[PDB]
Design a protein around this ligand. Structure first.
Ligand SMILES: [Mg+2]
Ligand SMILES: [Mg+2]
Ligand SMILES: [Mg+2]
Ligand SMILES: [Mg+2]
Ligand SMILES: [Mg+2]
Ligand SMILES: [Mg+2]
Ligand SMILES: [Mg+2]
Ligand SMILES: [Mg+2]
Ligand SMILES: [Mg+2]
Ligand SMILES: [Zn+2]
Lengths: 102, 189, 68, 72, 165, 138, 142, 53
RNA sequence: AGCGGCGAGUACACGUACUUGCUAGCUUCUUAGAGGAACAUUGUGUGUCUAACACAAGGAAGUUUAAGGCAACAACAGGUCUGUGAUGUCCUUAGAUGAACUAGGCUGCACGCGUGCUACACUGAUAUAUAUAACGAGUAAAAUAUGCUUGCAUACUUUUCCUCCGCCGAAAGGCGUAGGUAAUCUUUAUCAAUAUAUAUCGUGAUGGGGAUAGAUUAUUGC
């Protein structure tokens, strides 16, 4: 019924494994599944100074926090997909289900 | 049927020095319609001698900080200078420029050599690549200094300098600097 | 420079000693043989080990090589 | 050594300028040096001559260089 | 249909080319020549008026001198018409960004500037009275009518036939 | 019938689509004559003059460009045109003639067929650029 | 092609009091008067119907009189209020545009008026220092 | 009356402070971190930031 | 995210450009996961013919292909207690060296030193016009509306961040109204300036330069 599954996470292994498991689990039920869509990766950056005080050569360090996102579509029921979603996922990935009928 | 600037042929031009024949490029790969090629010429030691001669001229023509990287303005300057050169003393302007390149560099020089602790200012010999480079540099500097705070435009100055350099006349910058270099070289050894 | 550290040379020398009858004078086949025999986590070091193996195999044709 | 270029054309000089059509390199600098006038005056006389087809274009001019020549 | 005169046609436009051309739309004519020629056309046929208050304004913050042509209003109008053909649903902010320059701030460094808005809005309203532009009901901004496109394209074809004969 | 080949420069990318036709060449919906820097037009016209007019009467080319600057867009357009003609001849005509044409273009110069790998260097703290450092005074 | 006679071209003028106005073009030659910049020279020249492409040495007397008239009382013409100096004058509450000489007197009077009241900015004019907030510890050092 | 803490403090350096120290200098306000720079350099790893180059 | 496919148009040449409703297939362009690819390979030279180096050909690439991050043993009486509910000792603790409220100073100017911005012009200044980037960011208080004499009770129903578009104003800006918690909107098949074209000026402290001063107008904020 045009259900969309959305995944976000900080870890690449985690979300890749979860996507693989959901993709294979839904295919045991003979369902029309749209392959994962990997959206652009977005990076959060902070550039702060070392040296609690102010003396010495001025050096910096560059920090990065990047976010991954996947996207799966399929035709099914709400109860089926909400059971399939929840098998005690590695709780470092966020999963949310939405109905895109329009 | 490839012409420089779509007007001038350099299919009949000759060098007639035989020392500088290998160091200036008007031949197979160097025949171009316009002096803009974004090549990699400085990666090796001697690859500089396959850049077409007019492109080396335009490469030295953008100098003194104010004009760094402004390549197209230099190309326009050089093209109009070549038109002015052809108009008076009607010849192939590239042949005149090659003749001027052949004349504007010294053939010998001086340097400090530490023979046995006591030294001198001994005369040495100049290589063909050094002579070509110095000719280009001195012609460009002469034209650039002529046009600063002057009524005459930069391309008029460049045309005059090239024509005078080809004719050995001691009214050009390159000829007189070169003669002074050679005089000191003959004096110190 | 392209000098090879002692880890690369020791691994190559043992490989030549133990599997001489299979090895050849071609880099790609020796790359595959080295993939199969040894244990090397990085493909870069594997390429360098296979290259030295091939270089050593070429020298043996000319006569004795010291240490093998 | 200060230049004393005139900014306009006289009756007496009027005949003198028009022999600027009877020579090879016609650039504003050459006219200014020859007749000791301004550069605006030299550009105006070049325009006057080329309007009446008394002077020939050597090439495609640009906003920064304007050489002409005498008529064949 | 057209008997008007075309502006000065410089060379470098008459070079032979190694492919084959067409000319049906303004995407086939040179832009500077079209702009000047159609500006003269608009001035001659009284299709727009020079706002009386423009005789003493400049066109932006960053300029600090006036246009010094006396025909700048019509020239900007014709550039705006061609721009409308290239970009359909355009507002006044787009046009302010479109005619930008650089502003020299004395002994402080330079920065990019932005054009004014009264000139632009008055020109657009003027062309709305003439029935060459309209305000997209569904969308936003404003675009060309059928009359405007037809007139612009007919002039472009006339210019092209004039040049290459 | 139809091929699609790209050309690249610093950050510009151009795509040329080649079909059978009657001689038309267009760039973003416009004729090639309207490429903007007039002094660099010969670079775009070069491969055509080399290959010639007779072999190219039956083709129609559309080109889109994106990114970069003046010069880099010109160079990407040249490379895309050359690679597109070579590809069309490789896919729909005997490829001995493909080899001949490729040799002509390669004899004139590479970068009519081979991309340029250069790329702007990252800057490091302590100076205005990648190499230059602030002025040290003692 | 203009052939203007050498005996009618006049080299030094006196347009307002204390002016010279040499052999220049009209726009730039009007900028020797002590309150005429480039913007207002252009506007004034347009309101007097005089061709900007001629030199000041070939302006007749009527054109000079017209220009001098426009420089005074420029609100009778169509010059808006935001082109003027002195837009409320503190003295008469009018928009005026001060010109040469007159301008120097106005500057002198402003300085002495704010120095008579013991205002901070006038007192810093009297001591010979910067008045608009500048640091003055490393620059301005004659 | 009372005049204790009556000056307006809706904006400016005197308004916000470190989430950990309570200091008022060199606060990170990007993404609403709201920690001064020293504590953040100490806690960045467990927060989620990494050093790659 | 694109391309393509099917229709209806607006104009031209006998297919091209643009607008528009709908939606066979494909991955070149966009995005992002897994892999592969260079080893000095081949030829020629130098070297104890070892360890290695140089040139040419091929190749996307042959200075370990380019740039960075990490950083041994041992030290400095190097800097920081003005980052810290990290801390030893000594001071001080109600006329406080605690915590606040009002005004002022940190910016004061005969002078000396370091990092810089703008220039000294024509390879320019001014004015019009054409063409063209990459990395980013973005939503407990005060504020808008009845009963009452500058205050109270009231929706946390709007608003507070980026702001398209329309109108007003020379301009700065003001008024009214969308979208967006974001590959969806601002806004990026493009959000800049060096560039390019045409005209004016013309070697004159000059239309170079823009410091120092006078007057009027807006916005942030008690
Ligand atoms: Mg502009
Ligand atoms: Mg730099
Ligand atoms: Mg100082
Ligand atoms: Mg792809
Ligand atoms: Mg502490
Ligand atoms: Mg206080
Ligand atoms: Mg301080
Ligand atoms: Mg001055
Ligand atoms: Mg100036
Ligand atoms: Zn803290």
């Amino acid at each position: 019924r045009r259900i969309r599954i959305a995944l976000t996470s900080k870890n690449l292994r985690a979300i890749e494994k979860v996507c693989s498991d959901i993709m294979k689990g839904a295919k045991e039920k003979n369902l029309n599944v749209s392959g994962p869509v990997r959206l652009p990766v977005k990076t959060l950056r902070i550039t702060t100074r070392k040296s609690p005080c102010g003396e010495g050569t001025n050096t910096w360090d560059r920090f990065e926090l990047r976010i991954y996102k996947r996207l799966i579509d399929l035709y099914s029921q709400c109860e089926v997909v909400t059971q399939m979603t929840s098998i005690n996922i590695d709780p470092v990935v966020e999963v949310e289900v939405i109905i895109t009928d329009s | 049927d490839i012409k420089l600037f779509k007007k001038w042929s350099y299919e009949e031009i000759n060098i007639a020095d035989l020392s500088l024949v290998d160091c200036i490029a008007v031949s197979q790969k160097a025949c171009v319609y316009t002096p803009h090629t974004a090549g990699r010429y400085q990666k090796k030691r001697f690859r500089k001698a396959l850049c077409p001669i007019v492109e080396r001229l335009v490469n030295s023509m953008m100098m003194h900080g104010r004009n760094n990287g402004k390549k197209l303005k230099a190309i326009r300057i050089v093209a109009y200078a070549f038109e002015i050169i052809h108009l008076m003393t009607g010849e192939n302007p590239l042949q005149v420029f090659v003749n001027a390149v052949q004349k504007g560099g010294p053939r010998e020089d001086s340097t400090r050599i530490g023979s046995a602790g006591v030294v001198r200012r001994q005369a040495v010999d100049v290589s063909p690549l050094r002579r070509v480079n110095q000719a280009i540099y001195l012609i460009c500097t002469g034209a650039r200094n002529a046009a600063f705070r002057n009524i005459k435009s930069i391309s008029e100055c460049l045309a005059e300098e090239i024509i005078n350099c080809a004719n050995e006349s001691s009214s050009s910058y390159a000829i007189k600097k070169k003669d002074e270099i050679e005089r000191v070289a003959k004096a110190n050894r | 420079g392209r000098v090879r550290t002692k880890t690369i040379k020791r691994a190559a020398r043992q490989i030549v000693e133990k599997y001489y009858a299979k090895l050849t004078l071609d880099f790609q086949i020796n790359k595959k043989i080295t993939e199969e025999v040894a244990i090397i986590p990085s493909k870069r070091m594997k390429n360098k080990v296979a290259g030295f193996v091939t270089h050593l195999m070429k020298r043996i044709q000319k006569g004795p090589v010291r240490g093998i | 050594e200060k230049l004393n270029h005139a900014v306009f054309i006289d009756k007496s000089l009027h005949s003198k300028i028009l022999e600027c059509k009877n020579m090879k390199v016609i650039t504003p600098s050459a006219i200014a040096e020859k007749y000791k006038v301004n550069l605006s005056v030299a550009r105006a006389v070049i325009n006057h001559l080329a309007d009446k087809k008394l002077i020939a274009e050597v090439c495609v001019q640009s906003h920064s260089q304007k050489l002409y020549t005498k008529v064949a | 249909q057209f008997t008007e005169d075309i502006g000065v046609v410089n060379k470098r436009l008459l070079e032979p080319v190694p492919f084959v051309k067409t000319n049906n739309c303004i995407k086939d004519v040179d832009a500077d020549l079209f702009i000047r020629s159609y500006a003269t056309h608009l001035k001659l046929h009284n299709k727009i008026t020079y706002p009386k208050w423009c005789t003493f304004v400049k066109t932006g913050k960053g300029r600090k001198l006036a246009p010094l042509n006396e025909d700048w209003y019509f020239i900007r109008a014709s550039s705006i018409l061609r721009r409308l053909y290239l970009h359909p649903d355009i507002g006044v902010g787009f046009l302010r960004r479109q005619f930008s320059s650089k502003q020299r701030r004395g002994v402080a460094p330079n920065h990019t500037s932005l054009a004014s808005g009264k000139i632009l809005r008055s020109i657009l309203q003027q062309l709305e009275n003439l029935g060459y532009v309209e305000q997209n009901p569904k969308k936003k901004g404003r675009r060309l009518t059928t009359k405007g496109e037809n007139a612009i394209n007919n002039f472009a074809r006339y210019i092209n036939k004039k040049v290459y004969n | 019938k139809r091929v699609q080949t790209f050309g690249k420069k610093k950050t510009a990318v151009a795509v040329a689509t080649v079909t059978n036709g009657k001689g038309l060449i267009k760039l973003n919906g416009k004729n090639l004559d309207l490429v903007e820097p007039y002094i660099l037009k010969t670079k775009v016209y070069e491969p055509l003059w080399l290959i010639g007019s007779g072999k190219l009467k039956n083709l129609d080319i559309r080109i889109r460009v994106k990114g970069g600057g003046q010069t880099s867009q010109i160079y990407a357009i040249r490379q895309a045109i050359g690679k597109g003609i070579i590809s069309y001849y490789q896919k729909y005509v005997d490829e001995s003639t493909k080899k001949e044409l490729k040799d002509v273009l390669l004899r004139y110069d590479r970068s009519l067929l081979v991309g340029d790998t250069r790329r702007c260097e990252p800057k490091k703290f302590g100076g205005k650029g990648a190499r230059a450092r602030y002025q040290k005074s003692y | 092609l203009q052939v203007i006679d050498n005996n009618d071209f006049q080299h030094i003028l006196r347009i307002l009091n204390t002016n010279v106005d040499g052999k220049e073009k009209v726009i730039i030659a009007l900028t020797a008067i002590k309150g005429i910049g480039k913007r207002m020279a252009t506007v004034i020249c347009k309101q007097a119907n005089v061709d900007p492409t001629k030199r000041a040495g070939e302006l007749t007397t009527e054109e000079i009189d017209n220009i001098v008239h426009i420089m005074s009382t420029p609100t009778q013409f169509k010059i808006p209020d935001w082109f003027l100096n002195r837009r409320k004058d503190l003295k008469e509450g009018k928009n005026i545009h001060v010109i040469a000489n007159q301008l120097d007197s106005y500057l002198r009077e402003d300085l002495e008026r704010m120095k008579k009241i013991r205002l901070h900015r006038g007192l810093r004019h009297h001591w010979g220092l910067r008045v608009r907030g500048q640091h003055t510890k490393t620059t301005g050092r004659r | 009356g009372c005049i204790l803490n009556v000056h307006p403090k809706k904006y400016g350096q005197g308004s916000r402070q470190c989430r950990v120290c309570s200091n008022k200098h060199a606060i990170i306000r990007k993404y609403n971190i709201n920690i001064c720079r020293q504590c953040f350099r100490e806690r960045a790893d467990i927060i989620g930031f990494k050093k790659y180059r």
